[PDB]
Amino acid sequence: PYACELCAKQFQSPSTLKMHMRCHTGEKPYQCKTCGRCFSVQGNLQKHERIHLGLKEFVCQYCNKAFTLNETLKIHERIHTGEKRYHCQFCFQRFLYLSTKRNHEQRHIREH
DNA sequence: GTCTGCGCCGATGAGTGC
DNA sequence: GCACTCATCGGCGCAGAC
Ligand SMILES: [Zn+2]
Ligand SMILES: [Zn+2]
Ligand SMILES: [Zn+2]
Ligand SMILES: [Zn+2]
């Protein structure tokens, strides 16, 4: 609907195209008031700002370890739930971590 | 050299509400 | 139609264990 003049990717609205163009201009409008690091995406600055607060607000319901970000907590909880979301494309094996799945698939390929 | 665990990013998407 | 918030998910880097 809204196409990028520089790489042909397409977007839904003026605002999402405007956001994508920052990948090409390097514009980073949103500046951390503590350390001065700038971000292209306001939501990414907000994650960063949690680091300076030092409040690890996201707590594991299984072992009670605390984390700075919700996403970091959720990745951690996979250890407890047994969620293995990375599937080998060649066999039944399932993996907790993407890097491990990738190395396992490469072993299939080296065998042909 | 690989597996684990995790800290911190870029960039896109879903949901929401105007 | 539109923008905003937060989720999502890959990438990367690293340290400890083996
Ligand atoms: Zn582009
Ligand atoms: Zn900062
Ligand atoms: Zn836990
Ligand atoms: Zn396999």
The ligand with the least distance to the CA atom of A23 is 1
For chain A, the residue count is: 112
Closest residue to B3 (CA, C1′): A100
Q: Which nucleotide is nearest to A77 (CA to C1')?
A: B5
CATH number for A56-112 (one of 3.50.90.10, 3.40.50.300, 3.30.160.60, 3.10.440.10): it is 3.30.160.60
Task: HSE, CB side, 13 Å, CA atoms: give it for residue A63.
Answer: 11
The angstrom resolution of this structure is 1.7
A 10 A CB-CB count for A101 gives 19
**Beta-strand pair A58-59/A38-39:** unpaired
Domain ranges of chain A: 1-55, 56-112
The ligand with the least distance to the CA atom of A35 is 2
In terms of Cα–Cα distance, which of A25, A16, A52 is closest to A37? Answer: A52
Q: Output the six-digit token pair for A26.
A: 């390097």
> Which residues neighbour A21 within 8 Å (Cβ) at sequence distance 6 or greater?
A4, A6, A27
For chain A, what is the total number of helices (H) and then of strands (E)? 4, 8
